[PDB]
Design a binder for this molecule. Sequence first.
Ligand code: HEM
Ligand code: HEM
Lengths: 361, 361
Amino acid sequence: QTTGTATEPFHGPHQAGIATPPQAHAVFLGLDLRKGTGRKELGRLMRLLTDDARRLTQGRPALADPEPDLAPLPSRLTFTFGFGPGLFKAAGLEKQRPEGLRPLPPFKVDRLEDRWSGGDLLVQICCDDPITLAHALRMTVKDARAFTRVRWVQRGFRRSPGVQSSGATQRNLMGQLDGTVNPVPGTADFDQAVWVQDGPEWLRGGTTLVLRRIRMELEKWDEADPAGKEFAVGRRLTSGAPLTGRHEHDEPDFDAVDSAGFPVIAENAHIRLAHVDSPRLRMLRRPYNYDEGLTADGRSDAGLLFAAYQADIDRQFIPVQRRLDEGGDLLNLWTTPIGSAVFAIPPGCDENGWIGQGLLG
Amino acid sequence: QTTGTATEPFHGPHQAGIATPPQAHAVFLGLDLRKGTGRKELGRLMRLLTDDARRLTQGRPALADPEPDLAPLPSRLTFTFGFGPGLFKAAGLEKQRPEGLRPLPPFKVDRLEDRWSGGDLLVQICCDDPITLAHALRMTVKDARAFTRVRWVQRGFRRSPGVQSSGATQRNLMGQLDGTVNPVPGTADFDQAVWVQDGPEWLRGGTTLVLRRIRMELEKWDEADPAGKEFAVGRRLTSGAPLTGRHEHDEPDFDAVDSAGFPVIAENAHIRLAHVDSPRLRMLRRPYNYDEGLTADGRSDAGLLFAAYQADIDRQFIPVQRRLDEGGDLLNLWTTPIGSAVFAIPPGCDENGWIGQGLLG
Ligand code: HEM
Ligand code: HEM
């Protein structure tokens, strides 16, 4: 009943944390495999981590929990595990790597930093409470340290629980309503867009994650005229309505023109370039905001942990980003991708099973 | 009514953020004055910041707000401004610096880092929502940048709103219930312990802040035996009860002995060394937790933003810390102060007034 006692099921055909409505906090933990971590070792690793998530998400201490009193109040804690391209070579399982699971191709907007890119193994931990989250992260590292090195850890947040109603769209650190057009969990379009059905059999019921750390150049954004800001996106700042409508969820009319005959939503508006007509081909956007550090003279380092889930990186992610990589895409003046990683996310498990057992077992 | 629409009054005899029950998130912003920032400039600065807090805490955009749509949902946003020792020399107001407002004396446990210590000007921003908080921080830096350089920014969190009931004690990242013995806002003991009445007149109705960034050596803490953990503190881990009682709020009996004649609460137990018999001399503890970064092999960098408020640093803070600085203080094995700063926090203001006007006006 409480924000603190509420739980998310750990077991199911799918891993939690994907269809789960985004919780208030997230940590994306990126791990590289140690020299001796092969197929057997990854099995022991995933069995450890599986049981940790199984207990902690239900508010129970992990086995050998160093802080058992931090286990209760799970606050909708979820774990989502993902396998990077390198994990299949280390496992001797190159035959099982999906064809599209590989570093994204270069984009003109890219300013990618190694310290925010790549990784053999992802542990994505989401939770409505940051103390519960912190404990879950320590326990993960307690069992992963023998097998892996920490490549990076990216921390993000959304609104605190209760600040806005459930399902209402939340704003990003540019002040924009962010998440209006999105596959809805528990619809035909969602399952077909998100859950893998083709390709190697182990991944069916899983998905893929494209995780891109995108900096917001807020100093430049601030000085941008507000009417220019709406022209660049294709929607109004306060209402979130498309420029052709009046309410946030009005459907963007990409054929409307104005008095002078010009498109109401501009040719390079961000919702035009990013739109895909076929809903079943769309990506699931499930981002978190980040805010990290200030320089001496007061420049912010903040932006978006852009988390995209799709059944097929080549069909559903790369074309959109390629289309965004154009010159007239005005949002590129104010955003800069500084990190890129891709992960194959296995199906869920039941009792007696473990995450990744279909691949590594 | 909502966690998001709830507000804290900005105006009053005292600044908010001190007696205010701690909100879910905090940022402590440490600023050093630029070479040209004297008494007149500090007046313009404090008038800018005052009006920013006045509007933003009530869910209204600041003047020249770059992200006005991030102003609503204030979520109990508060600002607390503090003046460092150097601020009085730059203002030509050395006569008005409280005698005790100076860097803390050295302690044996100290491992102080310049990047977490000192500062001429504090902006402490607390809020139940991290997006609201982030916007408030950007607006603060927007108006402070011309006058100051950012020395440090320390970010901290407690439970999310709704995870525990109001007033229930929350745990720290060592799993300990933290905050049981504390002056209660709106009692004689609180007002006498917290609000300045003696010393220079401008500070009456204000207070002082001792802000110490204290790292938790969690790798060592984890390997410490649980019964040893309770012996070191003087209280039980799950219940929070003193070793002489059964419930969290039972009064510690510092005269009880066991069968063998030995003190039940040990001579160097952390609640014994830190206890002050006279409640009116106690400090107000209002800490935040921090969790920042992992090394390659999985060591955490986490701990406590220990925020202590008192009318008199020499009478109410330094003796306790000095008493904690002893050799048998076992908590010192697992905690390390890595940052120290002190601030004089002015009284509040009304409309037509501004924070610090009694000092700088
Ligand atoms: C910091 C970077 C970005 C910001 C601030 C941003 C912002 C927005 C905003 C304000 C909207 C309209 C509201 C909504 O429907 O969510 C939107 C829509 C969308 N964005 Fe972005 N976006 C960013 C990056 C990206 C990237 C890299 C992609 C890559 C695929 C992407 C894909 C989409 C899609 C598919 C939509 C839905 C458009 C539609 O069909 O109406 N966004 N974004
Ligand atoms: C990371 C460092 C620290 C940790 C983990 C810690 C933890 C605790 C715990 C678990 C308690 C008992 C529960 C409570 O009443 O809050 C306590 C009490 C207390 N602590 Fe600490 N503490 C730390 C540092 C400090 C420091 C530096 C001071 C400096 C004055 C201090 C002053 C006090 C006081 C006054 C009490 C109340 C004791 C009583 O009269 O019963 N603590 N602390």
